[PDB]
Amino acid sequence: GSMTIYVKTQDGKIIKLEVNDDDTILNVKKKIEEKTGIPPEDQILIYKGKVLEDDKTLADYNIKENDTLYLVKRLKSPE
Amino acid sequence: SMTIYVKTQDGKIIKLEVNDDDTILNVKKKIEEKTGIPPEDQILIYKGKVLEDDKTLADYNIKENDTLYLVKRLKSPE
Fold first, then answer.
1. How is chain A split into domains, by residue range?
2. Which end of chain A is more exposed for a tag (fewer CB within 10 A), N or C?
């Protein structure tokens, strides 16, 4: 059922997300948006070096409790 | 001179010959030459940190046989 995963950002922040192992990567991206403001289209999630696709689930990638995803923004922050 | 490796998302590995004072943009341009991915669509990560186009490999302490990670900015259609 429920599980707790962690998403690490670039500035080093760690986001505690409460998900379901049958949640889509896009659902995870939407929760990340809710807690960060980054729209899901601008998010890239990496798990053990591999990029995750929005249409798959965490169970497809064997992501379990306390596992860590890495978040990287698609577009470069303006300056 | 230096030899580095760039690992992509599909698991493929590209052996690149670079110079430690080559800019990250030069590295991205060589990646383009060997893959066709335009430099604007490339993100290079080294040990979890995204690399900036205006800095060099020596600026990021990248040495021989080190491994960078390439991720495409836009999702490839399928």
1. 2-73
2. C
- CATH assignment, A2-73: 3.10.20.90
Within a 10 A sphere around the Cβ of A51, how many other Cβ atoms?
Answer: 18
How far apart, in Å, are the Cα atoms of A33 and each of A46, A57, B15, B63? 16, 17, 36, 36
Can you name the CATH fold of B2-72? Ubiquitin-like (UB roll) (3.10.20)
| A72 contacts on B by Cβ (under 8 Å) | 43, 45, 50, 71
A-interface mutation test, from B25, B71, B78, most A Cβ less than 10 A away: B71
C-beta neighbour count of A1 within 10 angstroms: 5
Residues of B in contact with A45 (CB under 8 A): none
Helix or strand holding residue B30 (H, E): helix B24-35
Say which experimental method was used: X-ray
Resolution (A): 3.0
Residue B6 near residue B71 (C-beta atoms within 8 A): no
